[PDB]
Design a protein around this ligand. Structure first.
Ligand SMILES: Nc1ncnc2c1ncn2[C@@H]1O[C@H](COP(=O)(O)OP(=O)(O)OP(=O)(O)O)[C@@H](O)[C@H]1O
Ligand SMILES: COc1ccc2c(c1)CN(Cc1ccc(C(=O)O)cc1)CCS2
Length: 337
């Protein structure tokens, strides 16, 4: 609603509407649809493919309004549009088409050639965005209808399995809508209107989003199994590669606080390659899927060391000790976050 129409698009909008309408009757003839008097899908002969004048003026207006909304959403996409030159409209080349491919209309709908016209990756990305929004407005119209999703298509029960996000939509519709959208935006370029898109933005979730406010879960051995002397080894296999920590915690570790943030636990975050105890340092490399990190503690001279896939992880210095010295205290137990 907030979108205002610039004067160039304003006085070119009717030509856009009619040319894309003719372009659609070209898409129809390419798909094999032929022109007829009456609206009956079985007979494949409809007045829809004939020129807009013989088209029902209701559908013709509804198509033009649909394009007004589509170009307004294009402008809402943050993409600026600039007319190239007046001569790009003064000379309007138009491929000739075979009579079987060509409509009864004398002048060929086919605008300046798609070979000459070029599509950038950003332009294709905004084509995808526009296809997304068109399906959204198609769906909201259905919700106003009261149609609700159904795996089986139903008209009496108004259950369309096409009421899913465009990401999960079936290929055939995605292709047909994409074709009309991208040939439309290519006609936009061929009219000299250059669509300079906004810069692509990068954002990272970093596992902030979570079901339930809880950010992480800690699994540990029982307190009674604490080891106060000897040399011990246990493995941790990482099915994924994310915010995961493994190491040894005291029987006083808190299940709400992250490992290594306090003095209770000594952990290794392979995600950021950091050893964690009362802070973070740099230690080791980053793991991948199906990586086995073995944690080893020798409580005799108070050392702890980690081996990712067998090789010994190292800090910035060549030392193999993740934590050089620590008090025995009340023992250590295997712990993971
Ligand atoms: N003959 C046409 N002329 C113009 N645009 C059309 C035409 N057919 C389809 N469209 C466009 O493509 C969309 C396809 O909607 P369509 O009515 O085919 O969906 P549907 O799944 O059959 O709907 P419902 O859920 O009500 O059964 C329309 O919203 C419109 O934008
Ligand atoms: C530019 O505007 C138009 C004008 C005409 C047509 C399309 C888009 C493309 N679309 C594709 C499509 C197919 C199935 C569904 C559906 O059943 O959900 C929705 C859209 C309708 C077929 S011709």
């Amino acid at each position: 609603s907030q979108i205002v129409l610039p004067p160039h698009l304003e006085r070119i909008r009717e030509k856009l509407a009619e040319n894309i309408h003719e372009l659609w009757v070209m898409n129809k003839i390419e798909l094999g649809w032929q022109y007829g008097p009456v609206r009956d899908d079985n007979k494949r002969q409809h007045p829809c493919l004939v020129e807009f004048s013989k088209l029902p003026e209701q559908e013709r207006n509804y198509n033009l309004q649909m394009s007004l909304e589509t170009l307004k959403t294009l402008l809402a996409l943050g993409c600026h549009v600039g007319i190239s030159d007046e001569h790009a409209e003064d000379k309007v080349k138009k491929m000739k088409l075979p009579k079987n491919y060509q409509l009864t209309s004398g002048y060929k709908p086919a605008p300046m050639d798609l070979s000459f016209i070029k599509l950038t990756p950003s332009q294709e990305a905004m084509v995808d965005k526009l296809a997304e929004n068109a399906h959204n407005v198609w769906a909201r119209d259905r919700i106003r209808q009261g149609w609700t999703y159904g795996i089986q298509q139903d008209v009496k029960n108004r259950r369309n399995p096409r009421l899913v996000p465009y990401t999960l939509l079936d290929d055939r519709t995605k292709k047909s809508n994409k074709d009309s959208l991208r040939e439309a935006v290519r006609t936009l370029l061929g009219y000299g209107y250059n669509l300079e898109a906004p810069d692509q933005d990068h954002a990272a979730r970093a596992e902030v989003c979570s079901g339930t406010g809880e950010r992480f879960r800690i699994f540990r051995a029982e307190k009674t199994y604490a080891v106060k002397a000897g040399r011990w080894y246990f493995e941790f296999e990482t099915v994924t590669a994310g915010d995961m920590r493994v190491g040894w915690s005291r029987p006083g570790c808190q299940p709400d606080q992250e490992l290594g943030s306090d003095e209770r636990a000594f952990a290794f975050d392979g995600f950021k390659a950091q050893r964690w105890h009362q802070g973070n340092e740099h230690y080791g490399r980053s793991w991948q899927a199906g990586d086995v990190v073995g944690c080893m503690v020798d409580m005799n001279e108070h050392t702890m060391m980690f081996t990712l896939n067998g090789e010994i992880l190292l800090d910035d210095s060549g030392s193999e000790l993740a934590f050089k010295d620590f008090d025995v205290g009340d023992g250590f137990i295997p712990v993971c976050s």
